[PDB]
Design a protein around this ligand. Structure first.
Ligand SMILES: COc1ccc2nc[nH]c2c1
Ligand SMILES: COc1ccc2nc[nH]c2c1
Lengths: 346, 346
């Protein structure tokens, strides 16, 4: 793990300088393509990309897990939905599935802690049948966290070998916006009221209780903000852990990762906390409709591309942004050059 | 023309109600897919869509024209770029071309007023070799405007027959952000300073002059804000006119049109001014980096999906949004249903 972390490559500034130069000479007013240009330069700096903005195979990793905190009345979806939906993931009927297929990406369903019998077709990395209830104690042990980090990391980088160059991260677990709020609050120093959202249609009347739960998790666990692994294990969840793992793995592998929504922001705060070197590999997707979105993003210093008012999760936002990433490559590679037209612009 | 305008169909509320119902039953928390849901319902209401969100063939229409106002020192690109770039459009090397191809859309280059010899491969609808200089008089005659409106309209709806279901609109004409600013100012009642942008990298020192030019165009022409055709003809341009025409045609045809950036916003204000019935067919794409973007959009009551800091034009933003439109259809059609999973959500 310390190994893994140490070995995260820095971006190739040399490749980046060449990219910029090339971009500047394309058939257009310099910088006219805004964020598409920036995006492309960002990709060129990623070592696993071979000095150029390029997209090979695409995968979306969905981390599924149940949470003890569900018993605190924080989630109106019935617990079993995790298991059901997870199964659906295997049939290509979910929101992520549909969106991924549209993006030509492949969805990988990973069970890291579902409170149900194993589901065939789902990758089994199950830590336990749901995590501990953060309202009265830690979600899991430090060891348990580090281990999953390792395991997910590896799996992630291993896909790299199969030709994957672009990752999308997602989750599935009833009541997960709660631990998410807790983490944000902790890493960010914001009060719970500020970061707690309605999750999957939580009735306005039930908000108050959700906030209390969050505050409690915090007070009881005393998670240390300067220690991401500490935070994750105490008030996080299996699914949160797994997302952070994907992020560490893609970074170690020198590859780009597309974030999703609020849950994903939480995991990104942790990964950056654990390894700042991770930052440059992260790519925002959309701007989640969850209440704590703006704060979480501000702390990440990220401005998403898409404003869709989405709040489904599953990695649906991630899939949705893939074409944008492809567009930047097409731009980079297929556009003609000013010089070839004898055009000169200031 | 009065005919055309009269015959613009209202959206099918019945189809819309069925869409919503169907959407609500999909494998997810109701409304969790935000704007993607809204988008889909919007499409279902379009008569040319056959009661459902669907996308057949896709086309991007690029209106190219030169402007007399170029002589007022408002644009740093050399005039000839219109002609050059237009030619490039025919080779698939431009920004729109690259983006359209990525979206599987076809680009249609239309010459409505280029100040150069005709370009083979380009559709010829040339009104004149550039429009009049708005700083000292009208861009063209009312008749000239109405005619192009008619001609572009028809061409547009005619594509509908060839299987096109989704239009994207774009332009190409050096110095065009100037007439654009003028129109915005007029329709919006904003002062020129507020709406005048840097266009294609206009040096900050040269801004002042651009604003004066705009104010002048206005004072001299006295365009009537309650008359879109009046505005267009006086301080607009051939390309502006043509964009408005695409919009009227797609609406008459009962089809959706994707807007681009600032120039496109201008044309949309005019079309809505001329025919409010046009509104429901319009679909924002991205949020242009041009200074007058926010005002123009506010007047259109539109919130774009994409924040890319783009300012290239050509219909590049339009192409970029196409996959989003496709995504809403996929969602609508390929997602599984809650009932089929025995899942019940509040
Ligand atoms: C290719 O040079 C230019 C200059 C201005 C432009 N506006 C749209 N495309 C452009 C290309
Ligand atoms: C299908 O029902 C549900 C409920 C919550 C969910 N969160 C993500 N997908 C979900 C599906």
């Amino acid at each position: 793990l310390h190994a893994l972390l140490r070995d995260i490559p820095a971006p190739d500034a040399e490749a980046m300088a060449r990219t910029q130069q090339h971009i500047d000479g394309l058939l257009k007013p310099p910088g006219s393509l805004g964020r598409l240009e920036t995006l492309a330069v960002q990709l060129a700096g990623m070592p696993g990309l071979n000095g150029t903005p390029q997209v090979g195979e695409k995968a979306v990793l969905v981390m599924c897990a149940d949470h003890g905190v569900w018993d605190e009345g924080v989630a109106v979806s019935p617990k079993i939905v995790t298991a059901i939906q997870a199964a659906n993931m295997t049939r290509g009927t979910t929101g992520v599935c549909v969106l991924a297929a549209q993006a030509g990406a492949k969805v990988h369903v990973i069970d890291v802690g579902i409170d149900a019998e194993p589901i065939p077709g789902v990758v089994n990395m199950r830590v336990a049948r749901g995590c501990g209830n953060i309202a009265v104690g830690p979600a899991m042990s430090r060891l348990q966290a580090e281990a999953l980090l390792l395991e997910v990391s590896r799996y992630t980088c291993d896909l790299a070998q199969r030709g994957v160059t672009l990752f999308g991260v997602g989750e599935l677990g009833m009541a997960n916006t709660t631990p998410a709020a807790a983490m944000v609050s902790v890493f960010t120093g914001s009060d719970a009221k500020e970061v707690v959202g309605i999750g999957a249609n939580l009735p306005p009347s039930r908000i108050d209780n959700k906030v209390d739960v969050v505050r409690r998790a915090i007070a009881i666990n005393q998670p240390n903000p300067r220690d991401g692994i500490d935070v994750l294990s105490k008030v996080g969840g299996f699914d949160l852990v797994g997302m952070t793992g994907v992020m560490l793995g893609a970074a170690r592998c020198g590859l780009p990762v597309l974030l999703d929504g609020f849950l994903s922001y939480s995991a990104a705060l942790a990964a950056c906390q654990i390894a700042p070197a991770v930052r440059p590999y992260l790519i925002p997707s959309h701007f989640s409709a969850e209440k704590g979105a703006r704060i979480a993003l501000a702390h990440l210093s990220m401005e998403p591309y898409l404003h869709m008012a989405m709040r489904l999760g599953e990695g649906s936002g991630a899939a949705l942004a893939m074409p944008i990433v492809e567009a930047a490559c097409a731009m980079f590679h297929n556009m003609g050059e000013l010089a070839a037209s004898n055009i000169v612009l200031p």
